[PDB]
Ligand binder design. Structure first.
Ligand SMILES: [Ca+2]
Ligand SMILES: [Ca+2]
Lengths: 715, 715
């Protein structure tokens, strides 16, 4: 049954916002799993934070089809190498959603101004286009090398670029550009299925007719093919971070032929194998939401090395991975360490080895592990050193092919070598970040303490007992900001005094406040490695339960743009809250976890363009759905335990390595049955409120008996 | 006799200006012939156009010793990797010229604030330092990665950089920076002869004590070695355009040992072999001026490829030359095609093969040959496509190892593929550049017509007869701007009308005027490939002679900063005039050439800091002296003829390939004997006013009979 699973993915979920609500910043264009190429229309001349992927569902004009982007980020970048079909040298066109389709590996739209049909597909490193022009009209392609994310942010400018016509069917070039990533070099090689008859190249006002090459900072091409009289024009475009030669080789290996439908079909088969890793059973809407979410987790991290292994490293030099390896980038770690990376350990252990290796390369050539990585380099966005949980998690779980001593070097040195937002001599001297020395101090203290717990766990695994003590002590530094009267984590200055005045509802931004894109209410819960300690500090399990109740019911509104989708003070759009609904289990009240998780799944996710309660954040919003719908969530994303919530779907099957399955099953009378009555794992009654990574990866079956009313299970 | 020739070089010639006069923009620090490293003190925090090499003789403060620069340019760039010795973390110091020495491959200065002695030398790709601290004082080195040319020009900013301490004796890093060259990557590897005891790294206000690495845009290091108590600190620094690994390898191969005096001695031996290629006899002052000029021609073009052959190409990718090859850059072509490159065909034919190959690489990866090349890429400074005369000249003269068909491809395509300041479809449609379509139109028309003559000559050599006609016709386009009433070359618009009003004294700049850094009086003479045509147009030899007389005696003053050193309207500081004193030969009055050449040599060159009548322009001012002092000059620098002037020196011997000499000899009673009475070449009386390249390269002897009064020779 071809398209059995892929037919459920709706790439328009998360591409817009309804009224003035919240968008995922997802894109509907074609891509391949963990690919280099995201071939998609831009509905803006210059993508910005409100439409960072390049597309907005509320818009009606397409300004070209570019080949790279981020999914669900709060800042725009990439947007490289932009083609537009036309008959009269035009650069934009109207379109309607009524004449537009999208599915895994495929996008189509009718461009209405000149009645030209556009279809897109991809391979791992190539974009394939097919354009159908009216019979009797001239066929032309415009290449725009200036089109990019907004040039008024990040000091973004094109340093240099080239367009070069090699023969009548081939064009190469490149651009070097600054932005959110400090410096990116994007090389291309392009071919046409019909010969170029005439052409024009320009750089701003400087125009050159039928000229084989141009160099500059504001380049544009127009290639004219004449009357095609019903033959569609097929275009192929390969990219590289290193060279035009590599891009050409990427095309020779992955995309040598000219059969468009064959490319489309392979892309669909590829997505069917990927999405097939979790087979689910539920309503038609739930399958659409679930498979679309699973898709969003699998469109990055992005392939960066070429088919010959070469890539631009973090010291801006050209290097090569081994034959069986792939260098990846796009690591939105402040979001993705929480759920996306745990999800990859279940579904993509072979890729996780390459992700870890890619992170370690930043250490090897830049001096510390990635904080937030984009086009092979760090941009320091957000806080923490959250490569560390990801590398730790992979090693403790036994993901194969990782050099452990080298990984520990990287992790250790990243934790003792001070760098922006990590003053480690301040850290160990005070036992916290003082707000007057390091801003975002309370968020950093909580998140960094968690990173240190991870280092400790890795030290213990390698019998490095002195290191263990050092990092274990550091992991307990959250205590130094716990205020004993108010029972919030609050900021202190270097004299050890509590900053006055303090309001736990007050949102901070990305500096000038002790919290990062949230308030003290939301950050209170961030001790994922020692919830028992946190419970004790709050005044015991009963006290901790009541504080959670206040958190989930208190509707006061002070503000920050990123935090949205509210259940009291709980904002599902920002990921400090994401683990919190699972904390009622720890308090002795699992039914409350089941209640709130079910509320969020049913109420804050949907199958319209709005889709999500905030930016998808490289699929972290989606990974939350994937996990929670299956019925468990990695509260501590480095301890290899998944905390039970409430399974949404009737059944899920995880297709694992190799010949193995983890089968999740439900006994229910209706969808109102959201409370767990009991759980069985491999025939034995299951008394804990978690399952382990080993429980899943061994293969087996887990059965949930559900009911309409709270049971008493784990109570 | 060690230092027989090197003792004559005075690196302070051209480093200053006296009253408000004119400087060469030369530098006194250490370098090697055609090297990668120019290790020299900067007397400014941020070098600008008034001190573009980094040093000014009128200054009394040193702000560090950097490792790269240009010699004699009108804009600053490079200035990379800056060390400063100190005992108390200081960044600047007073010095006096009384306690400062310099000679080929060596610089020394006493830094007076803390009484520290600095000595510098180089290899091809390494800089070697030796610092002597007072006994009883702490030894420290500051590394400054922000120090550069003025950041308010060219949009210059550091994109990213690194300092990284590898062990107690080794530091690596890099910087990526924009400027006059669009994008440069400079990687380094450094070692110390004593172990680092403590250290600090910072990025702006962010300071990290005893921390092994830092990344950012404004980086500074301080390394502390303790009390050395009389042991000098030796530092070694290698560079690369590609990687830290390559830089380290450059040090392993060229500079593995720790004997400073041995490095100094090899640098001096290397310079003695180079300067020894012309052995001269004259007064002590003339030998100082001559050998210093010869030195200035040999400090660039600069080595860019590492010892493994790797280099950054003009498409910003990493490539590799063959084993026996070297990739070079720093091609100040608008100046250097005139005399410097002709000089290299006599003295450096083996290097010229590599220069030509390096130029062709820009064509291969960027689409046309270099106009003005800097750190492996074009910056378009000035006008013309003046790689073309250089490549043409080398091929016609039979410089070996140049692929001629590939070279012709590069030359041809660079002459028909339009690009900035070369609208070739405008060129062939109008038979000139119309000022209202292309500015600097008269200068471009004259200089481009000369480039086209060169292409024609190359076409004829390869029996490409259609091409010959095309480019020969183009070479005659100077005629289309010759005004028949006024007898100047003047600007026209696209309707073919002469622009009114027109003043032949009025200087233009680099746009908005039809002349480039000069007036119509100075550009009038630029038809070096058809002086007979120019003579006819002026009204015959008598008329042409009289126009030259007016040019050399008319003292009116309107203005431009670059044009200076005046003999009437003749300005020796700018190179459009440079061939003009030799034109009296063509008019039938060689004594007048001999008079004016002798005046310029004796009056506009000197052995003080001012030194030259304008910027040295990568040794073009110096190459003029070298040629003219020997007694001939390449008026047409692609026809292989050297036009006779007046020999200044008693004797010169050119030491050629191999076992061959060209011996130039004079019969004279005193230095007042400046007029040529007769000339002998290989025993036969020499009736022409030129000698050929073959006459010189075959070896032989040329004798000038001189006298106090004009003779009648060639009259
Ligand atoms: Ca978010
Ligand atoms: Ca000049």
């Amino acid at each position: 049954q071809a398209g059995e699973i892929t037919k459920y993915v709706n790439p328009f979920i998360g591409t817009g916002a309804i009224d003035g609500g919240l968008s995922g910043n997802n894109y509907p264009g074609a891509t391949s799993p963990f690919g280099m190429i995201q071939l998609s229309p831009d509905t803006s001349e210059a993508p910005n934070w409100g439409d960072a992927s390049g597309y907005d569902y509320n818009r009606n004009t397409i300004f070209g089809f570019s080949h790279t982007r981020l999914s669900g980020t709060g800042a725009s970048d990439l947007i490289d190498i932009t083609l537009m079909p036309t008959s009269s040298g035009r650069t934009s066109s109207a379109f309607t959603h009524d004449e537009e389709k999208a599915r895994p590996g495929y996008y189509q739209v009718m461009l209405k101004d000149e009645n030209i049909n556009a279809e897109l597909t991809t391979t791992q490193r190539n974009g394939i286009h097919r354009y159908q022009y009216p019979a009797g009209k001239d066929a032309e392609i415009i290449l725009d090398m200036d089109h990019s994310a907004d040039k008024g942010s990040w000091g973004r400018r094109i340093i240099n670029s080239q367009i070069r016509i090699l023969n009548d069917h081939a064009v190469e070039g490149y651009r070097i550009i600054t932005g959110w990533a400090k410096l990116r070099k994007i090389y291309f090689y392009m071919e046409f299925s019909s010969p170029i008859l005439t052409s024009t190249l320009r750089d701003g006002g400087r125009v050159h007719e039928n000229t084989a090459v141009i160099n500059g900072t504001n380049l544009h091409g127009c290639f004219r093919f004449g009357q095609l009289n019903g033959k569609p024009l097929t275009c192929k475009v390969a990219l590289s971070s290193v060279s035009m030669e590599n891009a050409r080789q990427n095309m020779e290996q992955e995309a040598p032929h000219w059969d468009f439908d064959r490319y489309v079909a392979a892309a669909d088969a590829d997505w069917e194998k990927q999405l097939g890793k979790i087979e689910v059973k539920g309503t038609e809407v739930q399958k659409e939401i679930f498979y679309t979410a699973l898709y969003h987790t699998m469109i990055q991290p992005n392939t960066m090395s070429d088919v010959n292994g070469e890539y631009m490293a973090a010291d801006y030099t050209t290097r090569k991975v081994a034959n069986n390896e792939t260098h990846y980038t796009t690591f939105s770690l402040w979001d993705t360490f929480r759920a996306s990376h745990p999800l990859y350990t279940l579904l993509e252990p072979e890729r996780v080895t390459d992700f870890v290796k890619s992170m370690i390369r930043q250490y090897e050539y830049y001096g510390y592990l990635p904080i937030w990585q984009l086009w092979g380099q760090d941009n320091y966005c957000m806080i923490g050193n959250h490569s560390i949980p990801v590398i730790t998690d992979a090693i403790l779980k036994g993901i194969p092919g990782i050099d452990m001593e080298k990984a520990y070097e990287a992790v250790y040195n990243s934790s003792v070598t001070s760098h922006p937002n990590s003053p480690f001599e301040v850290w160990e001297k005070y036992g916290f970040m003082p707000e007057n020395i390091q801003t975002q101090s309370v968020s950093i203290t909580l998140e960094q303490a968690f990173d240190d717990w991870c280092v400790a766990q890795l030290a213990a695994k390698l019998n490095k007992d002195a290191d263990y003590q050092r990092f274990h002590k550091r992991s307990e530094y959250y205590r130094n900001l716990f205020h004993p009267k108010t029972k919030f984590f609050q900021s202190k200055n270097d004299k050890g005094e509590w900053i006055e005045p303090f309001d736990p509802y007050q949102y901070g931004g990305n500096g000038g406040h002790p919290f990062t894109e949230g308030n003290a209410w939301q950050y209170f819960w961030y001790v994922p490695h020692n919830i028992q300690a946190l419970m004790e500090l709050t005044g015991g399990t009963k006290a901790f339960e009541q504080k959670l109740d206040t958190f989930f019911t208190s509707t006061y509104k002070s503000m920050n743009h990123n935090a949205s989708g509210f259940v009291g003070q709980y904002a599902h759009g920002n990921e400090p809250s994401h683990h919190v609904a699972y904390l009622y289990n720890f308090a002795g009240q699992p039914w409350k976890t089941q209640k709130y998780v079910s509320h969020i799944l049913n109420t804050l996710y949907n199958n319209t363009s709005s889709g999500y309660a905030g930016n998808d954040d490289c699929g972290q919003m989606s990974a939350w759905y994937v996990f929670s719908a299956m019925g468990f969530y990695p509260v501590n994303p480095a301890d290899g335990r998944y905390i039970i919530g409430s399974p949404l779907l009737d059944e899920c099957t995880l297709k694992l390595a190799g010949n193995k399955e983890f089968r999740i099953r439900t006994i229910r009378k209706s969808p109102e049955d959201i409370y767990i009555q009991s759980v069985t794992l491999n025939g034995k009654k299951h008394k804990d409120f978690f399952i382990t990574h080993q429980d899943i990866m061994n293969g087996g079956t887990m059965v949930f008996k559900m009911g309409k009313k709270p049971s008493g299970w784990g109570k």
